[PDB]
Short mmCIF file of N, CA and C and ligand atoms in Angstrom, two decimals:
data_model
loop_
_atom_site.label_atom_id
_atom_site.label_comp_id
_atom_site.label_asym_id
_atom_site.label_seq_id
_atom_site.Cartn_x
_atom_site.Cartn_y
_atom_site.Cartn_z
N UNK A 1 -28.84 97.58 82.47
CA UNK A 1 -29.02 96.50 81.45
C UNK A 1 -27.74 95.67 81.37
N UNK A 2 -27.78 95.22 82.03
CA UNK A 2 -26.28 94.45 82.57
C UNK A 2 -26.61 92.91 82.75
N UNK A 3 -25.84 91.73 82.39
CA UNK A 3 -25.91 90.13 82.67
C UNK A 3 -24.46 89.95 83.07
N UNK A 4 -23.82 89.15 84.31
CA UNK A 4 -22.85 88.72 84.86
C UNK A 4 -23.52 87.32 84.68
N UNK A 5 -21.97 86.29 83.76
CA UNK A 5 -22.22 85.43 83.27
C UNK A 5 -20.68 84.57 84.16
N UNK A 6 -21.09 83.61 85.07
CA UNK A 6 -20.00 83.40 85.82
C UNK A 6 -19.40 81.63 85.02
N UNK A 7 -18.14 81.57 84.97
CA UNK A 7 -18.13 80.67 84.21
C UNK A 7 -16.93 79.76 85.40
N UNK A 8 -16.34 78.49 84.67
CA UNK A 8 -15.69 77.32 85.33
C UNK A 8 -14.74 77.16 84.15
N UNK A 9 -13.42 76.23 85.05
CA UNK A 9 -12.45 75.44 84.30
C UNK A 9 -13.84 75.02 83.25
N UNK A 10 -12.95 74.67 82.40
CA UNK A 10 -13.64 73.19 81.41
C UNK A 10 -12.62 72.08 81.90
N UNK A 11 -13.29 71.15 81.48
CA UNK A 11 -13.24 69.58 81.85
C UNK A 11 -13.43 68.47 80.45
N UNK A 12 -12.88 68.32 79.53
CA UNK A 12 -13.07 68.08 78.30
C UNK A 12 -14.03 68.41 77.29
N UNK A 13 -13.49 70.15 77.72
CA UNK A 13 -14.82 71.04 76.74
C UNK A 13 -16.00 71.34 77.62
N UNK A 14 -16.25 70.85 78.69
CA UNK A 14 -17.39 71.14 79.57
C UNK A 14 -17.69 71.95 80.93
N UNK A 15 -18.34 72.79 80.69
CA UNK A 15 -17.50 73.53 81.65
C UNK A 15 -19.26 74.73 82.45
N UNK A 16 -19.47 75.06 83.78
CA UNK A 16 -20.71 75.35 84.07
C UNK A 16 -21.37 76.91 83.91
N UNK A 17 -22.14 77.53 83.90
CA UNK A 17 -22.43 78.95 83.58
C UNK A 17 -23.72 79.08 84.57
N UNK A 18 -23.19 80.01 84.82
CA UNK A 18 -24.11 80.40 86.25
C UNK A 18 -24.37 81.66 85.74
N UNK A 19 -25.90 82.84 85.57
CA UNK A 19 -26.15 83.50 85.28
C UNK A 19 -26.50 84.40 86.64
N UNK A 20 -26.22 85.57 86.62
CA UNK A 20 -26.31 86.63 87.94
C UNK A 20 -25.81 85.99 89.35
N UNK A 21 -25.48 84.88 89.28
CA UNK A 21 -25.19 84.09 90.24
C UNK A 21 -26.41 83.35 91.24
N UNK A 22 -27.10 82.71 90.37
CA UNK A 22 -28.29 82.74 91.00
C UNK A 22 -29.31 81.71 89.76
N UNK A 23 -29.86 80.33 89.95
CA UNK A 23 -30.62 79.68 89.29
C UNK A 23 -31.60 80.82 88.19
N UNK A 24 -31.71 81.12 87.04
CA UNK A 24 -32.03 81.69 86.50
C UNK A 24 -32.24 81.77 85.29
N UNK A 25 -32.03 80.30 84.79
CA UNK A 25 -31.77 80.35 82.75
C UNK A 25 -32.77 79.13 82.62
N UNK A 26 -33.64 79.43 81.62
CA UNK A 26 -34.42 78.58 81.34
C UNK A 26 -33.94 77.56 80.22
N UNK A 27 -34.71 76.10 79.89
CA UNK A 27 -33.83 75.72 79.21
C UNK A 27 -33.65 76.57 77.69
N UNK A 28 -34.30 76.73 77.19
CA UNK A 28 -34.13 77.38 76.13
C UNK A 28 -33.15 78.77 76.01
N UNK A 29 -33.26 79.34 76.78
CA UNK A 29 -31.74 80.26 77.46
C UNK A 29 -30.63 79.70 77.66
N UNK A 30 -30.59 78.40 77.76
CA UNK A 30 -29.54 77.59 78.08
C UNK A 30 -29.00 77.62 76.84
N UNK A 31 -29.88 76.84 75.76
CA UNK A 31 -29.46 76.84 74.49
C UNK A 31 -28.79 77.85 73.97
N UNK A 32 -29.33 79.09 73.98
CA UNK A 32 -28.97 80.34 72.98
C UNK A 32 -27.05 80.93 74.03
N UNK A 33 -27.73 80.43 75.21
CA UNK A 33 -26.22 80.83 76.16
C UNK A 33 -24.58 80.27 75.21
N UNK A 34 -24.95 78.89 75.41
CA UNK A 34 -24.33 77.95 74.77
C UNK A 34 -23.40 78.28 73.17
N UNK A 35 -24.68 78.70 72.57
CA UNK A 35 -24.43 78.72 71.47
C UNK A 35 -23.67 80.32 71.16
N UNK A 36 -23.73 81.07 72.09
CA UNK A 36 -22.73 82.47 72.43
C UNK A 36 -22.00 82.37 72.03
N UNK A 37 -20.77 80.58 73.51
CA UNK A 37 -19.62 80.17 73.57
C UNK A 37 -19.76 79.62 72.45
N UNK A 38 -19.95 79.36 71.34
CA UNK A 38 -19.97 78.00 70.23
C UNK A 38 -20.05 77.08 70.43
N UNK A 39 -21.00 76.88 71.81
CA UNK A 39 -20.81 75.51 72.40
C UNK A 39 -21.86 75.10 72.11
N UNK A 40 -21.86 73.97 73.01
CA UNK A 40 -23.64 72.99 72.96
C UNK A 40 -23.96 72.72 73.97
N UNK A 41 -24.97 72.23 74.31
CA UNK A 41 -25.59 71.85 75.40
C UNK A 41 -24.73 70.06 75.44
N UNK A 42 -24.09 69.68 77.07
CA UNK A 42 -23.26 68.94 76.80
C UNK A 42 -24.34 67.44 76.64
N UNK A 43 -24.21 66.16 76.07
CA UNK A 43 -24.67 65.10 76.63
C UNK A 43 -24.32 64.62 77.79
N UNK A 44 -25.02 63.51 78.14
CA UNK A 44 -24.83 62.89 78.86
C UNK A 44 -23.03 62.10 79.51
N UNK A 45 -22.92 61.69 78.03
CA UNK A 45 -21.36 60.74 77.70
C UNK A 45 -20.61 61.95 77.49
N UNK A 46 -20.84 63.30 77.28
CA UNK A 46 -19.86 64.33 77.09
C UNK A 46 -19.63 64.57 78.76
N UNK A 47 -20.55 65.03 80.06
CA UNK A 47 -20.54 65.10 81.02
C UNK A 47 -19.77 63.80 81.86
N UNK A 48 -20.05 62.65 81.17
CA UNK A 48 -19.68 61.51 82.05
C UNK A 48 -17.93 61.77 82.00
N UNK A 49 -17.37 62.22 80.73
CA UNK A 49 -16.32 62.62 80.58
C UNK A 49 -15.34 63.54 81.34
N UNK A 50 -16.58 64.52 81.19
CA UNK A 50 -15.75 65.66 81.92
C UNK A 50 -15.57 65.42 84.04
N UNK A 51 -16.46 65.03 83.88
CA UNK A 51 -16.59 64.03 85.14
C UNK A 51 -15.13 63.40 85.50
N UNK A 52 -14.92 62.40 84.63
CA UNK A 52 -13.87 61.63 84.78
C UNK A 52 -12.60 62.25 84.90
N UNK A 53 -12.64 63.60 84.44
CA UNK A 53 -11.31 64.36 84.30
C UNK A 53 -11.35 65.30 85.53
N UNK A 54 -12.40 65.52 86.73
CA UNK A 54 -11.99 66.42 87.51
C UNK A 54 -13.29 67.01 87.56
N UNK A 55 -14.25 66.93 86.87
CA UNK A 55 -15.22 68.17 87.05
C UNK A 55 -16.13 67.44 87.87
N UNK A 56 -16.65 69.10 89.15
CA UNK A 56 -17.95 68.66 89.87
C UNK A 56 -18.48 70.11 89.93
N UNK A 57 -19.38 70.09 90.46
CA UNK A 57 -19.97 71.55 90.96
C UNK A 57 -20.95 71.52 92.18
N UNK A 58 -21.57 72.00 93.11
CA UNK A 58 -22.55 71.95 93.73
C UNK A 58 -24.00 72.60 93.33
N UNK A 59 -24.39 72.62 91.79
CA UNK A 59 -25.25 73.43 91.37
C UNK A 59 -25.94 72.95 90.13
N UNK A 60 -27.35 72.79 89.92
CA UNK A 60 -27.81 72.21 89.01
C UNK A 60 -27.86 72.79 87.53
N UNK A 61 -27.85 72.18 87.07
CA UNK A 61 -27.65 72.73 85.30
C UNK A 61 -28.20 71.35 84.42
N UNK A 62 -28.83 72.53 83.16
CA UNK A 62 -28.69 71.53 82.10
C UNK A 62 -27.88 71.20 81.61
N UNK A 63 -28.23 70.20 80.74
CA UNK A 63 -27.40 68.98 80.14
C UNK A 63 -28.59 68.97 78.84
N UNK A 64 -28.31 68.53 77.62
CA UNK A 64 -28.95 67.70 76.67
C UNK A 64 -30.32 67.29 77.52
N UNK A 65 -31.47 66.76 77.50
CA UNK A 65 -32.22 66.30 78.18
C UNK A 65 -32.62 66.08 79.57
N UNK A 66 -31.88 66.30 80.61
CA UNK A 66 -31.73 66.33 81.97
C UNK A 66 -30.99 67.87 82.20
N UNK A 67 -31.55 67.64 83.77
CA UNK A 67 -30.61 68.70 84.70
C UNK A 67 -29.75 68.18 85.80
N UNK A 68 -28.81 68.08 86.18
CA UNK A 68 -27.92 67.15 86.96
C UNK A 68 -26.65 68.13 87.55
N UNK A 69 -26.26 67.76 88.73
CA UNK A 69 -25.19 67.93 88.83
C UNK A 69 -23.35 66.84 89.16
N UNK A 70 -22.71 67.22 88.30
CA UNK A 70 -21.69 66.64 88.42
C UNK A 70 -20.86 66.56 89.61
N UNK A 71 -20.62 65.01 90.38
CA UNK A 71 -20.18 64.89 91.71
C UNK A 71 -19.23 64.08 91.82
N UNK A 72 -17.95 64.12 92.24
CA UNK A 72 -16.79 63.58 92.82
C UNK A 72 -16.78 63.19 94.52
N UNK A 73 -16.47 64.23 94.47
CA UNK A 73 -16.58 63.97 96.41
C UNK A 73 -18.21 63.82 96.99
N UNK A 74 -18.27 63.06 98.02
CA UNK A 74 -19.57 62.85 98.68
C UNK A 74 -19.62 64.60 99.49
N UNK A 75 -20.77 64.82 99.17
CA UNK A 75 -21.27 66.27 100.11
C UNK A 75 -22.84 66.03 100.90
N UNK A 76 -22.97 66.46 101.61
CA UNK A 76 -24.28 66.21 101.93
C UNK A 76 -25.16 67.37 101.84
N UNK A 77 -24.69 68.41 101.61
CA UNK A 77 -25.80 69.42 100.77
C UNK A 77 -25.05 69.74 99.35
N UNK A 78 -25.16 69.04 98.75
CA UNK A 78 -24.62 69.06 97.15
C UNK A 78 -24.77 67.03 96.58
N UNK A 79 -26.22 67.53 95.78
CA UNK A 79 -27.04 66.08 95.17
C UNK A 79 -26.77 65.20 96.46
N UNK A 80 -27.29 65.42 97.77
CA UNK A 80 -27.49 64.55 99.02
C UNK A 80 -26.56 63.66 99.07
N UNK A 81 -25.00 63.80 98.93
CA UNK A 81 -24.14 62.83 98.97
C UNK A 81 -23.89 62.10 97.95
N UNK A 82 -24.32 61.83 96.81
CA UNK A 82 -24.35 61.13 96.06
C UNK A 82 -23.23 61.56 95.10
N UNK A 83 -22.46 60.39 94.47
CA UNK A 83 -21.33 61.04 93.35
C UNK A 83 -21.60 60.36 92.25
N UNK A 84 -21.10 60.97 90.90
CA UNK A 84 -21.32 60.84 89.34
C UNK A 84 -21.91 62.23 89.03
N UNK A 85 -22.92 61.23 87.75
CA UNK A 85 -23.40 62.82 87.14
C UNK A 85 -25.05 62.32 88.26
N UNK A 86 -25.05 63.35 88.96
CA UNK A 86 -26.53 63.21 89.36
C UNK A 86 -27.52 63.87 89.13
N UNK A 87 -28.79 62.77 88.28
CA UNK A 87 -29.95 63.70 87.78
C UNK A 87 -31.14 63.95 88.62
N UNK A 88 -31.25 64.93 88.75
CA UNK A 88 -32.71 65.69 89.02
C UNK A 88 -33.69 64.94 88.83
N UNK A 89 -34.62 64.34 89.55
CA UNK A 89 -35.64 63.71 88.93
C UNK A 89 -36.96 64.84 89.54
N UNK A 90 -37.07 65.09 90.75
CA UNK A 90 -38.33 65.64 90.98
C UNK A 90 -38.05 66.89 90.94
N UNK A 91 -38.81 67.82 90.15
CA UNK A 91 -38.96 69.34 91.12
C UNK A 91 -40.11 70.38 90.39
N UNK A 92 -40.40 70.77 91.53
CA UNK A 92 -41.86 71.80 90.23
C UNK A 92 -41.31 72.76 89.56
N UNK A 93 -40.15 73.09 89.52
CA UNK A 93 -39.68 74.38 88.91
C UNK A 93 -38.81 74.24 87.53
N UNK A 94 -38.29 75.52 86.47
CA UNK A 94 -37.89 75.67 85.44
C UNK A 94 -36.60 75.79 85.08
N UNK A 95 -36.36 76.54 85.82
CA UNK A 95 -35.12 77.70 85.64
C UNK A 95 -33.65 76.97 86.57
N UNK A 96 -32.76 77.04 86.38
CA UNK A 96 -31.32 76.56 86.47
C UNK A 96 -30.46 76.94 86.24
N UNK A 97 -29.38 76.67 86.58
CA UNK A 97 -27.79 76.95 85.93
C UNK A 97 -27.84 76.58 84.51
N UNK A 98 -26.69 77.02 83.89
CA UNK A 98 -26.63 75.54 82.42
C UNK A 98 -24.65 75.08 82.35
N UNK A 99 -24.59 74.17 82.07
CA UNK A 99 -23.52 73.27 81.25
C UNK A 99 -23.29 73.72 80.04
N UNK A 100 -22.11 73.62 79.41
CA UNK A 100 -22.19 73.98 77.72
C UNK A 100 -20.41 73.30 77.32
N UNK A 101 -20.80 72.63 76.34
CA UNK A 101 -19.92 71.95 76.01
C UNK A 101 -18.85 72.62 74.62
N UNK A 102 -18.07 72.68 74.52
CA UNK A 102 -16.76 73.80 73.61
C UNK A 102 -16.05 72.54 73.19
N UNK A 103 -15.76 71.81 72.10
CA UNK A 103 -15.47 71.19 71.25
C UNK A 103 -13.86 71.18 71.31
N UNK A 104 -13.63 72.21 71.17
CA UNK A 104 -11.87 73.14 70.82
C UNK A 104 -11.44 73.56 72.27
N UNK A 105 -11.74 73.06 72.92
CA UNK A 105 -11.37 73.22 74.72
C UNK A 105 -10.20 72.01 74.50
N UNK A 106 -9.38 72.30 75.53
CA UNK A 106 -8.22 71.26 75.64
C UNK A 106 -8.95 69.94 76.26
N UNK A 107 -8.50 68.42 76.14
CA UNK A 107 -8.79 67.40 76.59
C UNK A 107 -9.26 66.96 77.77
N UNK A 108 -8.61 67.74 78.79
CA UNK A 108 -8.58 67.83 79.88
C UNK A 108 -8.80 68.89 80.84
N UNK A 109 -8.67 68.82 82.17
CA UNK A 109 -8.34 70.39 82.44
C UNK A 109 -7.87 71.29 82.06
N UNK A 110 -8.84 72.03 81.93
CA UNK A 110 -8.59 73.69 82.15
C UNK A 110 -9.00 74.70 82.47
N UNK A 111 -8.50 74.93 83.57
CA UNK A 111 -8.46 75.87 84.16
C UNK A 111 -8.00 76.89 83.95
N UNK A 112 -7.67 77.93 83.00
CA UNK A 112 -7.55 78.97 82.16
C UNK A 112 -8.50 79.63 82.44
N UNK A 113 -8.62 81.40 82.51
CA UNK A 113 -9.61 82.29 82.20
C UNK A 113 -10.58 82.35 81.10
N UNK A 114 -12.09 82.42 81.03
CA UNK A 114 -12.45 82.90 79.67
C UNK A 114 -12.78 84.62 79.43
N UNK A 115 -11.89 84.54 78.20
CA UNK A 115 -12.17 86.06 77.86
C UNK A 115 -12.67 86.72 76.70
N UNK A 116 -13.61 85.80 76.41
CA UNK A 116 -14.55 86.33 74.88
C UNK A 116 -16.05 85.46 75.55
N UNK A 117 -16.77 85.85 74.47
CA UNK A 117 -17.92 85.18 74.46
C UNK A 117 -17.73 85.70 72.54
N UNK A 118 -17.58 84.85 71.77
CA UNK A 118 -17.03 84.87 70.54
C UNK A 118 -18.29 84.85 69.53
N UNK A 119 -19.57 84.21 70.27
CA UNK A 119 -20.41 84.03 69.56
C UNK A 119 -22.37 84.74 69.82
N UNK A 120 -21.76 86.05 70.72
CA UNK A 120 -22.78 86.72 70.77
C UNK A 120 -22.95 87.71 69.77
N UNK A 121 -24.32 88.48 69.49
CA UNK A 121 -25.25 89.09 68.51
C UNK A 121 -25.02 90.69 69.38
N UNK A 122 -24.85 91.42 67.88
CA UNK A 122 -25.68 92.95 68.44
C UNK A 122 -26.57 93.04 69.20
N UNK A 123 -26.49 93.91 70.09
CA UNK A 123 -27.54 94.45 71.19
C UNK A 123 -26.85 95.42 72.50
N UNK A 124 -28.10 95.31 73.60
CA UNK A 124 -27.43 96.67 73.97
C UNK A 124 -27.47 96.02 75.81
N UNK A 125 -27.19 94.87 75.73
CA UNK A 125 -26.90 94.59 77.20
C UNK A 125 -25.52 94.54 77.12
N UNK A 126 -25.28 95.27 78.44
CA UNK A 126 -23.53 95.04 78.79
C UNK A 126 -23.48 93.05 79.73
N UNK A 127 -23.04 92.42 78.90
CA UNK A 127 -22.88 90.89 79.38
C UNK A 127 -21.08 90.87 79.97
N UNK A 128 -21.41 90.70 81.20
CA UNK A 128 -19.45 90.62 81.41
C UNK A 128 -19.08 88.53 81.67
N UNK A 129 -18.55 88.30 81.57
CA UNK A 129 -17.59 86.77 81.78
C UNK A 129 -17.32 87.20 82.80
N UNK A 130 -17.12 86.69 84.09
CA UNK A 130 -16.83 86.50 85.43
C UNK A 130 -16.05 84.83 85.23
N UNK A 131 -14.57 85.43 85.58
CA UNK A 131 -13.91 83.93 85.88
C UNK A 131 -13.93 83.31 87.41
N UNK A 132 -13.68 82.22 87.86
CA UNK A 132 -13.84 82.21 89.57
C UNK A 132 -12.78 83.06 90.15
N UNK A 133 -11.45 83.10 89.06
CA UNK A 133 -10.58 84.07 89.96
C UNK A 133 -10.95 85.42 89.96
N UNK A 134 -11.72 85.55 89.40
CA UNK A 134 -12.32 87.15 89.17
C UNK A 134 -12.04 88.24 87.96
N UNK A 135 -11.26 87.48 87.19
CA UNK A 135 -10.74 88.00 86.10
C UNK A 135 -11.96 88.22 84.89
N UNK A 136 -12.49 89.33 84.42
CA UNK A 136 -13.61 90.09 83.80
C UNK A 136 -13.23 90.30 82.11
N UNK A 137 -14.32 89.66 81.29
CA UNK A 137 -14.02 90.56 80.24
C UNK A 137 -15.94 90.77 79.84
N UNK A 138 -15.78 91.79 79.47
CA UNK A 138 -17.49 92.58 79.04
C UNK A 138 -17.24 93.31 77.57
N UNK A 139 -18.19 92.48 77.73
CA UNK A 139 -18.76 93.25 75.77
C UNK A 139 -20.73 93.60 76.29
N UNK A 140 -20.60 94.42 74.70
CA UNK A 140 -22.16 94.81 74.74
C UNK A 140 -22.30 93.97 73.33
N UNK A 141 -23.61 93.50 74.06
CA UNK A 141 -24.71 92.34 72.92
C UNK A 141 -25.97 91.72 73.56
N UNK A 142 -25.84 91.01 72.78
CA UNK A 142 -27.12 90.17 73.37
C UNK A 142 -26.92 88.38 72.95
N UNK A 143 -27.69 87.93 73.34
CA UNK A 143 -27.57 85.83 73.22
C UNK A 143 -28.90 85.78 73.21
N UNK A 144 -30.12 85.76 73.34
CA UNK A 144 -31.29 85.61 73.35
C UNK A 144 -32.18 86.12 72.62
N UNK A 145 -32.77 84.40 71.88
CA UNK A 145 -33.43 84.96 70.95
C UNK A 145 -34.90 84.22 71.02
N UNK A 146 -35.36 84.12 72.29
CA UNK A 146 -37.08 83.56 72.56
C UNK A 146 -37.02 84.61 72.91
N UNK A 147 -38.38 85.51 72.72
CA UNK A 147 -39.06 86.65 73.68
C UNK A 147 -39.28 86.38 74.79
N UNK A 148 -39.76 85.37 75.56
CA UNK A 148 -40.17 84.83 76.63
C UNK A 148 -39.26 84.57 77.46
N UNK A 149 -37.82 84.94 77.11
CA UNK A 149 -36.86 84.93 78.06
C UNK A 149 -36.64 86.59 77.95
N UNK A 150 -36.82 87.32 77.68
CA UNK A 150 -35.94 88.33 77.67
C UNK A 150 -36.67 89.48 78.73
N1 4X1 B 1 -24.57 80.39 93.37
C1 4X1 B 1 -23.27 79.88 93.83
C2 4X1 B 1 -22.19 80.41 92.88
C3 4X1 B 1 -20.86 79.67 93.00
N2 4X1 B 1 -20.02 80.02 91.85
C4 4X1 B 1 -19.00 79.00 91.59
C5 4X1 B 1 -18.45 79.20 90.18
C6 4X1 B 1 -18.18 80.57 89.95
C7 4X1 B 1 -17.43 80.88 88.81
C8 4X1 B 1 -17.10 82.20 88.50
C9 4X1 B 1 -17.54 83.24 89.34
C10 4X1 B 1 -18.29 82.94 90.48
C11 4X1 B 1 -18.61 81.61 90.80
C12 4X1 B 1 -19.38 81.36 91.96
#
């Protein structure tokens, strides 16, 4: 009963969450994820931001209303070359990465470890933070509160 919750720099509070490492959070999982970190689901103009400061990823996530990924450099398997925030328009499927936006994050980069999830609930999954450098912190709880995700 275990969730590896892999996380990113933030980028003016914005920053990406990748669950098992692997497209997997619905949007509404996204939400309750989010709201763990005390964050939010970022907008659009919050992303365009974090954008501007450095952030990209090769991996789709929600956002406020869309799923997009954030692009700097041209890639051609990451949003087909294309740079900005790029949205998703077609696909038959649900489930994704998510974005989550932290208010009290520094302005800019940062690239710092995270080592709480400050705003999860009693329960009995072991959830660990996975930083990219590999640096771990795990608590037991839970973040989900639709049945239909769990
Ligand atoms: N599915 C591709 C995953 C790529 N990510 C990139 C971001 C990241 C952050 C923390 C731990 C692992 C990882 C791996």
């Amino acid at each position: 009963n275990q969730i590896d919750l892999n996380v990113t720099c933030r980028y003016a509070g914005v920053f990406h969450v990748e669950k098992n490492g692997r497209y997997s959070i619905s949007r509404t999982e996204a939400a309750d994820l989010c709201q763990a970190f005390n964050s939010t689901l970022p907008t659009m103009d919050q992303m365009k931001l974090a954008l501007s400061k450095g952030f990209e990823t090769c991996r789709y996530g929600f956002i406020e209303g869309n799923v997009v990924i954030p692009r700097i450099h041209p890639n051609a398997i990451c949003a087909a070359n294309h740079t900005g925030v790029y949205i998703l328009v077609t696909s038959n499927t649900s489930h994704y990465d998510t974005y989550c936006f932290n208010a009290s994050a520094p302005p800019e980069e940062d690239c710092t470890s995270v080592t709480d999830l400050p705003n999860s609930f009693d329960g009995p999954v072991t959830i660990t933070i996975v930083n990219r450098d590999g640096t771990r912190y795990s608590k037991k709880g839970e973040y989900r509160t639709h049945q239909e995700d769990i």
